[PDB]
Design an enzyme around this catalytic site. Structure first.
Site, PDB file in Angstrom:
ATOM      1  NE  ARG A 131      38.538  23.640  44.440  1.00  0.00           N
ATOM      2  CZ  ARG A 131      38.272  24.700  45.203  1.00  0.00           C
ATOM      3  NH1 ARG A 131      39.249  25.391  45.776  1.00  0.00           N
ATOM      4  NH2 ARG A 131      37.015  25.049  45.419  1.00  0.00           N
ATOM      5  CG  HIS A 167      34.160  27.923  37.006  1.00  0.00           C
ATOM      6  ND1 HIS A 167      33.681  28.025  38.297  1.00  0.00           N
ATOM      7  CD2 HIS A 167      34.300  26.600  36.756  1.00  0.00           C
ATOM      8  CE1 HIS A 167      33.532  26.813  38.803  1.00  0.00           C
ATOM      9  NE2 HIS A 167      33.899  25.929  37.888  1.00  0.00           N
TER      10      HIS A 167
END
Ligand code: NA
Length: 527
Positions: A62, A228
């Site tokens: 990312r 998450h």
């Protein structure tokens, strides 16, 4: 209706649209990925495992520095903007720059043959986001078919795209300096318009984590937890969720022959229960072996998509080769794992919540039962360490994807837990006073005691400084390791290391005291 789709693409600014490959089957994707004449990073290679492999270019992870969220009337007072008080990747973007970027991407996808995939982020019908991704690269369409929930034929008839992802990996922004951006690349989100733009980077994760960031915005505002974590369910229907940063044993401890997997990375918790946001798994493959990770290795076959792995001259995969990147990955639809919940990846309300940590300081108990306030404190802390001990703190165990303040995620998690009577436990899978790692035999015994409720029947003591409730004994667990002080020659040794760790938790938490609601939580943290 391809007619309707093309008009909607024109609306986004895409012109002279040629052939559109809408919602291709896995067979069509394989044919497209291995199509004669593909050049560059579009090219796929059929490996001996039967799975196609692709490379992503310069971006093999990312790019948070290139992430932006448009600041407008909708987001000005709702998004948790990066600030001096607490740094994050939610950097504001002007409406003018957004428009330029949208036009740039629209131009890049104009006059071309495109792939469009529509799927859902969220297994809950009430709280899901219909996502439509547009790309000019077939394997990117494959990534989305793998990672999001694949709609039924019926659903595809009335499918509404709540968010549209325009993948313009092939284009770069020439005016980035004038605009004050980080680089010529960009991953921008406009919450009001419901659009994610990707430019410059080919890394598949940007599509997965971008939509996760959006779910992390919409759901908590509606009282739904967006987490998450991994989640699994016992044969009787009892649901547990696990949080933990890399190296804490999350994958291994949430993998159990007797408990079906709901999901491995992103889940929601609404009025009906816990639901996976995803339609597949995006796993790390570095040093992958059939012996060690049989579930993941076994999932690598036709329809899985390998990313940045090294393929030998004979087509076989050298999983130990990190020359391209240490972050090699593979994505696959969830049914490539046998022991999963079906037909839909969701279950009832969670009754056990586990926060894993690999405490390299050797201070935390192998297991502690948290109070609701401590649950919020340790959720915001998101702590783990590695060896001198070096800590990592990541709010809500996924700071990079939080669109709201950490406290907003903690509040909804504890609200859902209170309603189902769920108990939370902090589990140290790291080290203790011996200087060695806690045995997996004991850790597995601890997870078992948590899930079967035996820990709730144990006589409890309380660890000083952190004021953590700890069991004196547990079935199948060495009682000599339950109090972290017992593994040191002298408890004074533990005391010194504990004051050190306590200090790191307090220093890390200070930034949250700039948020009015979270400030009082320091009372539940160490000392
Ligand atoms: Na395929």
């Amino acid at each position: 209706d391809l007619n309707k789709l093309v008009k909607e693409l024109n609306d986004l600014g895409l012109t002279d649209v040629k052939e559109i490959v809408y919602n291709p089957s896995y067979e069509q994707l394989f044919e497209e990925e291995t199509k004669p004449g593909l050049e560059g990073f579009d090219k796929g290679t059929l490996t001996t495992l039967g799975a196609v492999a692709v490379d992503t270019g310069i971006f093999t992870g990312r790019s948070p520095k290139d992430k932006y969220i448009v600041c407008d009337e909708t987001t000005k007072d709702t998004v948790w903007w990066n600030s001096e008080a607490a740094k994050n990747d939610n950097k504001p973007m002007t409406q003018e720059t957004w428009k330029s970027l949208r036009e740039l991407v629209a131009k890049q996808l104009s006059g071309k043959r495109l792939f469009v995939v529509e799927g859902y982020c969220g297994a809950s019908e009430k709280h899901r986001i219909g996502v439509r991704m547009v790309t000019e690269v077939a394997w990117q369409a494959h990534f989305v078919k793998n990672m999001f929930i694949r709609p039924t034929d019926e659903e595809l008839k009335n499918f509404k795209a709540d968010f549209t992802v325009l993948n313009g990996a092939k284009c770069t922004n020439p005016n980035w300096k004038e605009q004050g951006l980080n680089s010529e690349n960009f991953v921008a989100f406009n919450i009001t318009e419901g659009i994610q733009l990707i430019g410059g980077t080919w890394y598949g994760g940007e599509m997965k984590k971008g939509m996760f960031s959006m779910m992390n915005y919409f759901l908590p505002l509606k009282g739904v937890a967006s987490m998450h974590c991994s989640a699994n369910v016992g044969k009787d229907g009892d649901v547990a969720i696990f949080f933990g940063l890399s190296g804490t044993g999350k994958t291994t401890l949430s993998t159990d022959p007797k408990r079906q997997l709901i999901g491995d990375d992103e889940h929601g918790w609404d009025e009906s229960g816990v639901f996976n946001f995803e339609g597949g798994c995006y796993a790390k493959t570095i040093n992958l072996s059939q012996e060690n990770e049989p579930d993941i290795y076994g999932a690598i076959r036709r329809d899985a998509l390998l990313e940045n792995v090294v393929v030998r001259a004979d087509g076989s995969v050298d999983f130990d080769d990190g020359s391209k990147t240490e972050n090699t990955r593979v994505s696959y639809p969830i049914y490539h794992i046998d022991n999963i919940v079906r037909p839909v990846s969701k279950a009832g309300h969670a009754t056990k919540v586990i926060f894993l940590t690999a405490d390299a300081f050797g201070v935390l108990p192998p297991v502690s039962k948290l109070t609701p306030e401590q649950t919020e404190y340790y959720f915001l802390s998101g702590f783990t360490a590695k060896l001198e001990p070096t800590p990592t703190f990541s709010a809500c165990f996924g700071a990079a994807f939080l669109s709201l303040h950490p406290i907003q995620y903690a509040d909804v998690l504890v609200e859902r837990m209170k309603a189902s009577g769920a108990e939370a436990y902090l589990v140290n899978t790291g080290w203790n006073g011996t200087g060695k790692r806690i045995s997996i035999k004991d850790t597995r015994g601890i997870i078992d005691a948590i899930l079967d409720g035996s820990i709730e029947k144990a006589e409890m003591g309380e660890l000083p400084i952190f004021n953590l409730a700890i069991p004196k004994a547990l079935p199948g667990v060495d009682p000599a390791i339950l109090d972290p002080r017992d593994t040191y020659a002298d408890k004074a040794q533990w005391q010194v290391k504990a004051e050190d760790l306590a200090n790191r938790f307090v220093k890390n938490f200070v930034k949250y005291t700039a948020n009015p609601e979270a400030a009082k939580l320091v009372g539940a943290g160490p000392k």
